[PDB]
Write a protein that binds this ligand. Structure first.
Ligand SMILES: [Cl-]
Ligand SMILES: [Cl-]
Ligand SMILES: [Cl-]
Length: 142
C-alpha cells in the first residue's frame, strides 16, 4: 500500500505530496519535468500509478515495466519526458499486481483524472500546479 510508491525525496522536506500519475498524460509529464523544482522548495513527491486505460491495458504494462526496472526513477523519466519504451528488468508479474492495486486505490479514493495530487492533510489538487503555486497551496492548507 504505502510501501509501493516511487519517492523523490526532497532535502529538508517541509511537505510531502502523493501523486496518482499516468505516463501518457501530458500534464503528468509536465509534473515529472518539475520534480527538481518541487524538491528545491522542500516538497517531496511520491508517485502512484493510475493508467487511465485501466489496470490491465497496454499503459498498465508500461508502468509495470517502470516499477519493475532496476532504476524505476530513470525508467519513469525515459517513459514520460522521452516517450521511450520501457522493458521490465525483473518479473513483471510482481509489478502488474502493484499497478492493479494502485488503480484500485485511486478508484477507491475517487480520483477523476491525472495527475491527482493529495496533500498531507488529505485534500486534493485537481491537476498539475508549478512548484511555486503548489507551495502556496500547501502553506494555505497545511
Ligand atoms: Cl524509490
Ligand atoms: Cl483496462
Ligand atoms: Cl496483497
Amino acid at each position: 500500500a504505502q510501501d509501493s510508491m516511487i519517492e523523490f525525496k526532497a532535502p529538508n522536506e517541509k511537505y510531502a505530496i502523493t501523486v496518482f500519475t499516468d505516463i501518457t498524460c501530458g500534464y503528468c509529464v509536465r509534473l515529472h519535468s518539475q520534480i527538481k523544482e518541487y524538491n528545491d522548495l522542500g516538497i517531496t513527491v511520491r508517485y502512484l500509478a493510475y493508467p487511465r486505460q485501466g489496470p490491465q491495458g497496454q499503459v498498465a504494462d508500461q508502468m509495470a515495466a517502470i516499477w519493475c526496472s532496476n532504476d524505476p526513477k530513470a525508467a519513469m523519466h525515459d517513459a514520460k519526458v522521452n516517450r521511450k519504451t520501457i522493458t521490465a528488468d525483473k518479473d513483471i508479474a510482481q509489478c502488474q499486481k502493484t499497478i492493479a492495486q494502485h488503480y484500485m486505490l485511486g478508484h477507491e479514493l475517487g480520483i477523476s483524472g491525472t495527475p491527482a495530487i493529495f496533500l498531507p492533510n488529505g485534500e486534493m489538487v485537481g491537476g498539475y500546479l508549478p512548484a511555486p503555486q503548489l507551495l502556496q497551496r500547501l502553506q494555505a492548507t497545511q
